[PDB]
Amino acid sequence: SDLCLKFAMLCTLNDKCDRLRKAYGEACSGPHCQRHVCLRQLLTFFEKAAEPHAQGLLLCPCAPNDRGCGERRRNTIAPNCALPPVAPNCLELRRLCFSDPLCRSRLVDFQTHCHPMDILGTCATEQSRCLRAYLGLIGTAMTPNFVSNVNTSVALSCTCRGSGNLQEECEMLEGFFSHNPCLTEAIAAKMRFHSQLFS
Amino acid sequence: DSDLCLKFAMLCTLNDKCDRLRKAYGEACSGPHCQRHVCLRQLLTFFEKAAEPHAQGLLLCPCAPNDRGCGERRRNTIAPNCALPPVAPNCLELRRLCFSDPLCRSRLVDFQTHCHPMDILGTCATEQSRCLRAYLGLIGTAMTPNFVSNVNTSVALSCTCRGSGNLQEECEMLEGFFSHNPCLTEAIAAKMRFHSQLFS
């Protein structure tokens, strides 16, 4: 079985992690989903779960052609429940974030730790602090997730359509997720680690 | 080698209706406890409601002469340690207590009507089966009759004629109607023979 499933089961084996995962799983299930309740439970998960368990659960490696592994990784946070059905403009998302003191705090942290210092992936701080700040956005108004079940790219649920005079500022925000060597290499490194750990 | 008193108890247990009625008075009449009036009322219901042949099998059951276990079962079948006052009163006082309650007066009237001997031989004034039903109809009243012994079939009220004074004869007459009455004796004896034969 794939390593995404294995790391999910490592969480299940841990009484504390299993309880936190079941809790958001329950809050984020079904078509009857209550978005704000799911988001609260996700925030709680990443807040309270042991970092190695939370990172293993989400930042799990998938072979080239393992669509099932990637689909699992992509749905681990229950994006159909957690993300709005309609993607807003990305700056609006940031605005909503600024409007909430917890979210505002989480965005500042991510902007601090995941700032790229060069094309090699050097972060402003450390790789591990970047990952922590990144996962700290999950359950906020700016919840990032994997875009594909065949690759490891990650993005917000937003668009830069209807941006007008604010096109570049908008694409710049998207770029912090799509075109960020620090974030990309921190995720890729952790995934390599998880592969090598099991091997 | 069960005795026939035990066997007849069990024929009752085998009949749904009789089992429930026997269980009812057995419960009401148990224990050093026992509310005597509840026991008496469950006895009255039992003879009222049980099929006559089941009720007569239960009580008028035959015992071999030397079978004291059978006789003791028969003598305790109506739970006399509960049903009867622990002091035996004068028989004429007891009848007076009987007379005070319309039901008891009526049961005593029918026993006198059906169990009166029409001759010295013991022919009953009506028929033996009517006498037995009237005799059993006194069980649960103030005038409850019962077997007196575990070694013979004699029956009596639980009363004495001692201290009857100038009324000694009137007392003995009432007592005697139960204790030495050829109609009643013959009716009981025949039913007991029938019981021995049914099981032979």
Next chain:
Amino acid sequence: DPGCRLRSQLVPVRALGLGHRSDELVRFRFCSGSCRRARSPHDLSLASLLGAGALRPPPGSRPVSQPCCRPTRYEAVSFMDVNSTWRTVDRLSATACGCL
């Protein structure tokens, strides 16, 4: 009828384990039978797991996957003992049954 219900049998008082000795037989009534109608979602999944070989046996008795057929009401049993004395033992015999 294998479904939970009141059953009746004539038994020796001697087999009831009462310490009063009697030569009598009594009707003794008890509850037994299936309660699969009253199974919960938990019960149904527990029955599936057992049917599937999925559970290690816990120590002691097997888990039950359905309500138990049990008395909801009782009555006394009465009999004459070997000394010709009437005895009554309370709450000995069932009078009604439930899937509990």
Next chain:
Amino acid sequence: PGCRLRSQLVPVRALGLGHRSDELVRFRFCSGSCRRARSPHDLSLASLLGAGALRPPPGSRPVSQPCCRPTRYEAVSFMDVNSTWRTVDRLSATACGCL
């Protein structure tokens, strides 16, 4: 040994739920003896069963003890083979009793 809450990881596929999954879940259930408050009826039932005085009825045999049963429950949640989160209410025991 006595009546208690028990816990095991089981295949979601064994739960009889229809939704298919490759996940294991923690499942809790109740089992064990309820031999404590021993009732007159149960004492005699057990005596009669021990003396073989009872012909076995059709179906299940009678029990001479209360049954170890759940008294409270919680949901079970898992991702199915299509990576959709599913939840089933009141599937797993959280407390037991002798009922």
